[PDB]
């Protein structure tokens, strides 16, 4: 009574939990483990194991072996972790193709190990999240919302349908968002990100690396001296100086969010919403209807052409406007804002 965790024997066991949070370890042998209610951590260990999580958010920890396992997470948001396949010691399972693990949540299997002529699988059902290994991997989602993490290596991630959250990690990764409203994080290394259809979101870290960004259909967002961004020329310089070796390739992105430092953002011919956040920012909208937000600090705004609406927020903001343009809106906010008609 009043015991939450259990570790099994080296033989065949049948382990059942309760409505509380349990950590259930089966060790050697063929074990059937049920987590029941709550959030549970299930580790079958070596042997052919059948694992259930029932309701709640469960976690399955897999080991370095070729023996297949059956996993059914039931209701709730569930994840499976494959980090223990590659370890500093000696690895028993073969990876002769050099692909770590391969996951297809649409076809409900995980290729946990692979020799040249033999392929070892796991049967996975009702699991929405996957965590990869230190080597390169292939991660594929399904029609639901998935969280996919690649960890180290040169991984490839496909989210499938729905609103996903894809992580690349260290190394040079390939991330595909597919249909839905996705969120893409690249991490360290030189990556390329494309979200496809739907409204996507990209997050960058202002490091010394080169990334390729592709925003397909829909309105898409990128978030970060500060940066020098020119969507018209399709180039963003991360450290604020043009022509640097730390730059990004940008295509099909309409909205930009700046850094807390001093940034320079210029918009293309489409409709753009540009946000500068903290610091002294210089913002130009180009042509078409645009929305500009300078945030804190003293900012300078252009709104070159079209029916634009400009907000200055807190600070000593400066405005440039053409006297022959029509359909514009200005709002200096708090401070001694100045308007210039000499442009």
């Amino acid at each position, epitope marked *: 009574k009043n015991i939450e965790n259990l570790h099994g024997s080296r033989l065949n066991d049948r382990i059942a939990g309760d409505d509380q949070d349990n950590e259930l370890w089966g060790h050697d042998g063929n074990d059937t483990i049920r987590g029941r209610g709550g959030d549970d951590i299930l580790r079958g260990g070596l042997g052919l194991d059948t694992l259930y999580g029932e309701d709640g958010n469960d976690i399955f920890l897999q080991d370095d072996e070729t023996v297949s396992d059956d996993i059914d997470g039931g209701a709730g948001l569930d994840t499976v972790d494959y980090s223990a396949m590659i370890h500093p010691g000696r690895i028993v399972a073969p990876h002769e193709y050099g692909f770590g693990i391969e996951a297809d949540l649409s076809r409900e299997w995980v290729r946990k190990a692979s020799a040249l002529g033999v392929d070892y699988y796991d049967n996975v059902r009702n699991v929405e999240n996957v965590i990869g290994t230190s080597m390169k991997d292939v991660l594929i989602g399904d029609a639901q919302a998935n969280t996919l993490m690649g960890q180290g290596g040169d991984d490839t991630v496909r989210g499938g349908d729905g609103d996903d959250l894809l992580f690349g990690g260290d190394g040079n990764d390939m991330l595909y968002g597919d249909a839905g409203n996705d969120t893409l994080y690249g991490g360290l290394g030189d990556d390329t990100l494309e979200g496809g259809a739907g409204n996507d979101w990209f997050g960058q870290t202002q490091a010394r690396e080169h990334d390729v960004l592709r925003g397909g259909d829909g309105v898409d967002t990128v978030d970060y001296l500060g940066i020098l961004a020119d969507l018209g020329a399709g180039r963003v310089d991360k450290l604020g100086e043009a022509g640097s070796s730390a730059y990004d*390739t940008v295509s099909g992105i309409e909205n930009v969010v700046g850094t807390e430092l001093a940034d320079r953002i*210029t918009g293309d011919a489409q409709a753009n919403v540009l946000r500068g956040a903290g610091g002294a920012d210089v913002l130009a909208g180009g042509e078409g209807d645009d929305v500009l937000l300078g945030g804190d600090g003293d900012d300078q705004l*252009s709104g070159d052409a079209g029916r634009d609406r400009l907000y200055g927020e807190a600070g000593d903001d400066w405005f440039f406007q053409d006297a022959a343009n029509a359909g514009n809106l200005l709002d200096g906010g708090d401070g001694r804002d100045t308007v*210039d008609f*000499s442009g």
Partner: antibody, heavy 114, light 106 residues
Framework: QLKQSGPELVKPGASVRMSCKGSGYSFTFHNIHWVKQRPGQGLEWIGW????????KYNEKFKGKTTLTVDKSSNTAYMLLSSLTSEDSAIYFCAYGNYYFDQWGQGTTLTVSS | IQMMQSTSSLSASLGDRVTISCSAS??????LNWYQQKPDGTVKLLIYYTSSLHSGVPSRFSGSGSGTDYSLTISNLEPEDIATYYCQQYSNLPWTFGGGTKLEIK
């Protein structure tokens, strides 16, 4: 629109400073680049200066003989040429833009002879 | 990046279609510009990307290409299209221009 200085006549070995004047919008939103054009030749890029902070980037083969300066107050850009030689006679253009040069000047002629 | 414009001279009659091609030593990932220099000496920007048209230019001009080969095309020539055209890149420092192609009416 950018306004440049008139034609200049100089003796070899001397130094000449050239001017390029614009407006607040151009110097606030854009970098300023300098381009030369030798007679019977094409166009060569020298470098740019950022008027807001004065930071500079130079072409490697023009590093020694070129110094870029900017006067943010009066919106004037200056290029200083040193050790003028017979290969330095050309027409010098100033243009503003970040990755593409949007507006060009009318040009300034430099004559190196005696 | 050394940038090549093999066709130094071109000729066409009013209403013809003209193609000017420029090539690069390596990949430029669509980071190329086209400029016009009239006989009077003025220099103007025509397209500020591989295909993006500038504000003040007519719809006659158009550009395309990808990788190491790019081209500027005149759909229907006009008596104001006599000038020299250059190709410039911003993919790697220093930024380099092309040799130039001159257009003279037949």
């Amino acid at each position: 629109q950018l306004k440049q200085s008139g034609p200049e006549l100089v003796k070899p070995g001397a130094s000449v400073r050239m001017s390029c004047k614009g407006s607040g919008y151009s110097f606030t939103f854009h970098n300023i680049h300098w381009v030369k054009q030798r007679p019977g030749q094409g166009l060569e890029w020298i470098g740019w200066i950022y008027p807001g902070d004065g930071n500079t980037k130079y072409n490697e083969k023009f590093k020694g003989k070129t110094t870029l300066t900017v006067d943010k107050s009066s919106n004037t850009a200056y290029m200083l040429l040193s050790s003028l030689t017979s290969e330095d006679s050309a027409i010098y253009f100033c243009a503003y833009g970040n990755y593409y040069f949007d507006q060009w000047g009318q040009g300034t002629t430099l004559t190196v002879s005696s | 990046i050394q940038m090549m414009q093999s066709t130094s001279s071109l000729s066409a009659s009013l209403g013809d279609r003209v193609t000017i091609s420029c090539s690069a030593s390596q990949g430029i990932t669509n980071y190329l510009n086209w400029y016009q220099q009239k006989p009077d000496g003025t220099v103007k920007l025509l397209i500020y990307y591989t295909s993006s048209l500038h504000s003040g230019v007519p719809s006659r001009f158009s550009g395309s290409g990808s990788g190491t080969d790019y081209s500027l095309t005149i759909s229907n020539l006009e008596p104001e299209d006599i000038a020299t055209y250059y190709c410039q890149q911003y993919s790697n420092l220093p930024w380099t221009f092309g040799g130039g192609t001159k257009l003279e009416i037949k």
